[PDB]
Swiss-Prot record, chain A:
The keyword Transport applies. This is Maltose/maltodextrin-binding periplasmic protein. It comes from the Bacteria. Induction: Induced by maltose and the transcriptional regulator MalT. Permanently repressed by cold shock in a PNPase-dependent fashion. Its main location: periplasm.
UniProtKB/Swiss-Prot annotation, chain B:
The keyword Metal-binding applies. The gene is E6. GO terms for biological process: DNA-templated transcription; positive regulation of transcription by RNA polymerase II; regulation of Cdc42 protein signal transduction; regulation of proteolysis; symbiont-mediated perturbation of host ubiquitin-like protein modification; symbiont-mediated suppression of host apoptosis; symbiont-mediated suppression of host cytoplasmic pattern recognition receptor signaling pathway via inhibition of IRF3 activity; symbiont-mediated suppression of host transcription. This is Protein E6. Transmembrane segments: none annotated.
Length: 382, 142
């Protein structure tokens, strides 16, 4: 049971331990309604567990891709913004929070990975992926490396894999085709071959994860990294003279990163749905509300048109938008979990050199489809 | 078998449609495409599994392929576990009123199998919203 006449919000700690709480304090001063902001560990996992029993927060903040699965499980309330409110936010952010024809969350901010470079080691970052091996040889002589980024998560390796033709699920006639996975094709094979060749030629290491890449870049050991707005704050503290730019091109085509929309979903079991809509629409999704959050930790490119225009002058946010425009919105369909694990395994297997790239990608398409077939054998009954 | 709002969903309706019996029906595994043994046809029906259509053809699943994929699913999609009593308290229903499938073979657990979990103090596992346990046969050898 969720407590009535109060608001409990779950958001990741690196989105700000003060920003959202401050908006919550303004809401309490105006309404008398107490707002509690919490940062539980593995909240994206804790939420579907507790919400299934009619418990949890009133509001949940996470990337939009997990929201389709929560809506399918009946965990999210359908959101009802008026036309005048829908007009204040970009249409593509509303599309990202639409599940089975209904709006299931409020869009907050737009994020995409960008190329982060050290201006002191590399005044002019490379425009193409193909020039990175020659850049690494030059930097290795100076006791440095060209690029270091998280190779463990498929979200991080996708910009390069998708560039020449890869895609998660095909989107045609306003619907995702769960039978059309774009992992086993010429494009994805070309991108992953380039990535694996970088590892084989010792320009990158297969074991490189989030922490290793972050430490290397922030200690000035690597000229470049690939990360998002959630990483900027630690780079600020490191005092590294950094630039945020457009991702390199592969085969003359832009890198296609996934696009994430940080979203605020209202718990279906909440007795405070009207208080929740009020807080989200009239307190958070305002220039004043987003500024309180953004000044604490940067959100990226906000869904709110008025404030996005005000922030666009930040070149890091302009790079986030350029990369997002060249990217692929993450499908919110529950079938994405099959995709994520299959691609994660493919990259590990191919990078290890224990399997060819093509065979790894062929196994990924087979494996993702096999998980979905199992779900079909079992039926929807729970 | 064009639309899913028409085509037979489970094995008993499929037999009725083809005008055959479960003792005679010829089915192949959706994964390996090998013809199911007569005992596997009976197990597919006991497991209350759905017929899967590919290129307008019905397919079942053999025992080995089902167990293989069920294991990969549990490994990747395991959410959390509860003791039987806590599960009963959560949904305010006895275990007999809940759909609990075997984590290995997918067979919906019998009241006796659910009771073994309570007696042996064996937890039930949540696999992305699905509650699972272990049947008598899989408790012996998976
Ligand atoms: O212990 C063994 C094993 O565990 C580790 O990883 C495992 C992990 O703990 C586990 O949760 C799981 O992860 C799955 C996941 O559940 C899937 O949903 C899927 O994740 C994708 C995700 O849903 C997408 O939204 C997308 O995530 C992006 C975000 O959208 C970005 O915002 C950004 O997130 C940053 C975030 O904004 C910040 O608040 C901050 O907290 O830090 C984040 C950055 O680190 O980046 C992520 C991307 O990282 O893309 C996700 C897909 O990459 O897919 C996951 C599986 O790949 O499975 C893991 C493995 O079992 C551990 O890493 C392992 O080494 C270890 O083997
Ligand atoms: Zn088989
Ligand atoms: Zn079993």
């Amino acid at each position: 049971k969720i407590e009535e006449g109060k608001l409990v919000i779950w958001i990741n700690g690196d989105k700000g331990y003060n920003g959202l709480a401050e908006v919550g304090k303004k809401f309490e001063k105006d309404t008398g309604i107490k707002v509690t902001v919490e940062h539980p560990d593995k909240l994206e996992e804790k939420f579907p567990q507790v919400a299934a029993t009619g418990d949890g927060p009133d509001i949940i903040f996470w990337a939009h891709d997990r929201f389709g699965g929560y809506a399918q499980s009946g965990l999210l309330a359908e959101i009802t913004p008026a036309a005048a409110f829908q007009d204040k936010l970009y249409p593509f952010t509303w599309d990202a929070v639409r599940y089975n024809g209904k709006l299931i969350a409020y869009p907050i901010a737009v994020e995409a990975l960008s190329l982060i470079y050290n201006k002191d080691l590399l005044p002019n970052p490379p425009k193409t992926w193909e020039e990175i091996p020659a850049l690494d040889k030059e930097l290795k002589a100076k006791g440095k490396s060209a690029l270091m980024f998280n190779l463990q998560e498929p979200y991080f390796t996708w910009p390069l894999i998708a560039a020449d033709g890869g895609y998660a699920f095909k989107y045609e006639n306003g619907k995702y085709d769960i039978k059309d996975v774009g992992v086993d094709n010429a494009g994805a094979k070309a991108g992953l071959t380039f990535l694996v060749d970088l590892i084989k030629n010792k320009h990158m290491n297969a074991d490189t994860d989030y922490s290793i890449a972050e430490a290397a870049f922030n200690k000035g050991e690597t000229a470049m990294t690939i990360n998002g707005p959630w990483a900027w704050s630690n780079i600020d503290t490191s005092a590294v003279n950094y630039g945020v730019t457009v991702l390199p091109t592969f085969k003359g085509q832009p890198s296609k990163p996934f696009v994430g929309v940080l979203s605020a979903g209202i718990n279906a079991a909440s007795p405070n749905k009207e208080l929740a809509k009020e807080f989200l629409e009239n307190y958070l999704l305002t220039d004043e509300g987003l500024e309180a959050v953004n000044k604490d930790k940067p959100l990226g490119a906000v869904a709110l048109k008025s404030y996005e225009e005000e922030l666009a002058k930040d070149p890091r946010i302009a790079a986030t938008m350029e990369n997002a425009q060249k990217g692929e919105i993450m499908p919110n369909i529950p079938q994405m979990s099959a995709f994520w694990y299959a691609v994660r395994t493919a990259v590990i297997n191919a990078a290890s050199g224990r399997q060819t790239v093509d065979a790894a990608l062929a196994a990924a398409q087979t494996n993702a489809a096999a998980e979905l077939t199992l779900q079909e054998l079992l039926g929807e009954e729970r | 078998f064009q639309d899913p709002q028409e085509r037979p969903r489970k094995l008993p309706q499929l037999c009725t449609e083809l005008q055959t019996t479960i003792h005679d029906i010829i089915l192949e595994c959706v994964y390996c495409k090998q013809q199911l043994l007569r005992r596997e046809v009976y197990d597919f029906a006991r497991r209350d599994l759905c017929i899967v259509y590919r290129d307008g053809n019905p397919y079942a699943v053999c025992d080995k392929c089902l167990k293989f994929y069920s294991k990969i699913s549990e490994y990747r999609h395991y959410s959390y576990s509860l003791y039987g009593t806590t599960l009963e308290q959560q949904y305010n229903k006895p275990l007999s009123d809940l759909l609990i499938r075997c984590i290995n073979c997918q067979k919906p657990l019998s009241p006796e199998e659910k009771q073994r979990h309570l007696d042996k103090k064996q937890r039930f596992h949540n696999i992305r919203g699905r509650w699972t346990g272990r049947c008598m046969s899989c408790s012996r050898s998976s």
